[PDB]
Amino acid sequence: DVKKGILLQLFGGTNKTFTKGGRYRGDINILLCGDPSTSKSQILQYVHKITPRGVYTSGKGSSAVGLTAYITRDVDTKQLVLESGALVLSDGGVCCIDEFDKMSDSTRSVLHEVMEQQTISIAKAGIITTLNARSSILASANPIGSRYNPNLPVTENIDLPPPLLSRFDLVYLVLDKVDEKNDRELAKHLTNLYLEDKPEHISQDDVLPVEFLTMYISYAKEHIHPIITEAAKTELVRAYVGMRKMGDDSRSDEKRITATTRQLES
Amino acid sequence: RIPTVAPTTNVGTGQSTFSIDNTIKLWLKKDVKNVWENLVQLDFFTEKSAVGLRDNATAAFYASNYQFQGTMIPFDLRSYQMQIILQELRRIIPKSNMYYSWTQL
Amino acid sequence: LDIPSRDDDEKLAEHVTYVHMHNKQPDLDFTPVEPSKMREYIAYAKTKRPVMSEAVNDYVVQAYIRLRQDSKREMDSKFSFGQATPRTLLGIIRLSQALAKLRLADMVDIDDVEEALRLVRVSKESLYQETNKSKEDESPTTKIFTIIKKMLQETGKNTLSYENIVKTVRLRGFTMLQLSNCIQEYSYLNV
DNA sequence: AAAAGGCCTGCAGGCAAGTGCACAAACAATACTTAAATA
DNA sequence: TATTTAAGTATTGTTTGTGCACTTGCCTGCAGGCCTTTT
């Protein structure tokens, strides 16, 4: 299912451009969290390698300037230069961010803007401006401590404040199990790749187009524009309503994640 | 949330155009106590911790000899706990009622 | 955790002072290698890249499973190393591969990965007591009893006619006089 | 000389040590009631 | 047929019980404050 959400991120949305309003964040954004050592970071590497525009980036080894380019009034010709937007390099195509929790509170605030408007409004001594950086962030995470506490509420087990959290279009909980049923399957799924010297197709031997799929994506995102038929509208509305009424409670206020309009946007 | 129009002028020497604005008879402290007793005896409420009915007449009699102190605390401080919680309350009051939008917080 | 013992503070101290006497910790039976040519051989080994052997996998796999399950029933327990991860499995495999490098051989041995397991477990239980016990050595009649218990797992009867029991005893090699003695004891023991 | 990236320290993030103690029930024998023995 | 009150009844009064609490250290979690550069 993680893979599924990732794929859906790759094809992200369509640019519905209104003459009134506008800037409806044509793409999506996927946090994912779970027990340490559960492939998250490696999935991120894998995606960043897949896309033709990815910009890997770590957390807590980066600052707000690194996340969103920084402007400079060049005194040479007295002009506006922009520099090194990690987010701006990813204009179009995905980004990746690790240790998203370990990110500083001084940082992790530019997100509060770029993720929902895809713009960065900088206003410092010399210059005020708004540089638009359309980009589908894709962040890893780590629940507080070093694993769950299934005696702890979930939206407290994740640390991020509810605004920024609902900002995220889709949150995954990759929990590690003590199955012993998949465990030996996973162990074989590693030992096999260790069997060969140059291991390929580590999983079941079903043909899959490692290279073809990229051109497939870069065709799909550019030759087809889905128009939401009428019937979809109904089942979408009812789905949202059911999502939210379920979330309704008196004590859901402090501990739960509430279904909000961004659920419908998602 | 009511438009609360209270104009003052009118036709010359009209004395009309009254200024009614509250338009909900907020009941006083002196009267509500009636409704409060009605409720507490309709069992929607209860005392903080009250043993309803003892096991037998022995423990019941031994608890009636107890000179209680909640007697001493006045009417408007007995900490009553609830019998029907707000969530359920939202599920039953027909939405036609003009207070329905307060069942939910 | 340095348990303050006596033979340690004896031997260690003696041998440090002996270093002061003879600047070589190597005693009568020892082959110390100078770090230069040591490094040489080490790098040479590093230039090998051995291969994982196909047989050991299952064993390896099984090891992981074991190292998994106990961990759960040891989460809140004393040795609170919590929920050994697939990274532990991968680290075991890597340790085995490096030991095979030390073999300078391209196929990992079952003894190789077994040594790796010994390393990973000696890291454990090194906290306290560091001891175990054994009780099942004697078994001159208790073994008969356990055989009977397997038979009971099959059917579960306290019959008064023993013909498969005596057959399995004779197959086990235990005599019939000791068997009859034990039967006496357990009938008196009311089973 | 000051304004903008970055990194260091004062406020307190917090909670088990822990005692007070305000809840409860029989409590030990109150205070009094009611049948009997004697003139 | 009635004064003896002796036993008995109904009731008081109180005993420790705890059920809950709310206190006062604790280092770390956090965040306003110091360093740097450019004009």
Ligand SMILES: Nc1ncnc2c1ncn2[C@@H]1O[C@H](COP(=O)(O)OP(=O)(O)OP(O)(O)=S)[C@@H](O)[C@H]1O
């Ligand atoms: N189901 C799995 N499929 C593939 N690799 C796995 C799986 N489970 C564990 N691994 C491996 O275990 C290691 C875990 O790496 P990651 O999970 O990406 O790192 P990480 O989980 O981000 O670590 P943290 O603590 O979450 S930051 C990698 O070597 C993975 O290849």
